[PDB]
Structure 1
Amino acid sequence: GNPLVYLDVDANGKPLGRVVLELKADVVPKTAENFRALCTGEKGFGYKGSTFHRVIPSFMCQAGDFTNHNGTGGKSIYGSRFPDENFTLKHVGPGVLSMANAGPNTNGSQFFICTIKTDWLDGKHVVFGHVIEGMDVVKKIESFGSKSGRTSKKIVITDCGQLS
């Protein structure tokens, strides 16, 4: 089966709730495994204690830069970057979970959750899962962003892990 993982997210130290994500290991096993392991922290690094550093309302919420905390960093469980696995899954609507990148074959740990259909990203960003529950929490995160992407409170992944 596919992994279920979770992110517990706070704003300025106040809890927003839990986002539960299905990782599509049946379609993108390498990409799913990277995210899963970064949620559990089992490689010695991962998302716990890192931030949503760019949040654009009516677009997406971006996170995963646990090295630089500014959109320049992050790393994968495999190394500093890994190839685009495939583009089979598309950016079909709110709740799509997809890899940030710096061009072709530059996946690390940064990711985004869509708050709209972002189909102009199809074929360019690897989609590897979706929100199962806690879309309301994603909307709370979205409310602390701005058109520039700069957040108005510090949005932190206080805890994360695997449910199954």
Structure 2
Amino acid sequence: MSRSKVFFDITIGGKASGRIVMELYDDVVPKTAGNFRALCTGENGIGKSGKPLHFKGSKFHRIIPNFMIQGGDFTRGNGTGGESIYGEKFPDENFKEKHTGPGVLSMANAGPNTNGSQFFLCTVKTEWLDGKHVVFGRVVEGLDVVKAVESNGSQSGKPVKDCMIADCGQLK
């Protein structure tokens, strides 16, 4: 199909830090892009977990310098939770798009066919993830805000400060 545009308004340690605008690849990975889009708008409401199927208020719980920022765990907030709009986990749709550089938007997973709601924004080219994580979008504005979050990561993945998706939604 077409390409949806979505956003995150970010706070870092409670301070407004700008907006990340993303373009999704609806034409390439419609099922995967659709999940992400609906989790930006919150339009499928409460999920099987009893929590909102919505990125609003969740955090980037895992941030590794010179790698990527990862979020989407709005049920456990620690990497162990999350849920797609489809009901818990769904299969890898395709591997058409590759990890080419900073700004790349890709799904976190725990092995083949385990996509949920967790995702990462790459801060480098992560070509070693090609064929293992499904790429479904890219940042088109606010890459500076991605760098600001990145500066709060650690090798250990633990953030030094709460990096929060304070608002989010669909644009066009």
Question: What interval of TM-score do these two structures reach, taking the shorter chain for normalisation?
Answer: over 0.9
CA apart distance, 1:50? 0.3
- What TM-score does the superposition give when structure 1 sets the normalisation length? 0.99
- What TM-score does the superposition give when structure 2 sets the normalisation length? 0.94
Corresponding residue to 2:116 among 89, 108, 115: 108
Corresponding residue to 2:69 among 61, 68, 80: 61
Paired position in structure 2 for 1:3: 4
Paired position in structure 1 for 2:166: 158
Corresponding residue to 1:132 among 126, 140, 148: 140
Paired position in structure 1 for 2:32: 31
Q: How far does the alpha carbon of each residue in 1:29-86 deviate from its partner, in whole angstroms, 9 at most, with x for none? A: 0000000000000011210000000001111000000000000010000110000000
For 1:136 and 1:11, the matched residues in 2 are separated by 13
SS at structure 1 position matched to 2:27: coil
Q: RMSD in angstroms over aligned alpha carbons?
A: 0.5
For 2:163 and 2:19, the matched residues in 1 are separated by 13
The amino acid across from 1:102 in the alignment is: A
For 1:145 and 1:139, the matched residues in 2 are separated by 10
CA apart distance, 1:110? 0.2
Paired position in structure 2 for 1:50: 58
Paired position in structure 2 for 1:13: 14
Any gaps of 5 or more consecutive residues in structure 1? Answer: none
SS at structure 2 position matched to 1:16: strand
SS at structure 2 position matched to 1:79: coil
For 1:136 and 1:154, the matched residues in 2 are separated by 17
CA apart distance, 1:16? 1.1
The amino acid across from 2:142 in the alignment is: G
Any gaps of 5 or more consecutive residues in structure 2? Answer: 46-52
For 1:30 and 1:141, the matched residues in 2 are separated by 28
For 2:128 and 2:87, the matched residues in 1 are separated by 28
Q: Following superposition, which runs of at least 4 residues in structure 1 exceed 3 angstroms of deviation?
A: none
SS at structure 1 position matched to 2:69: strand
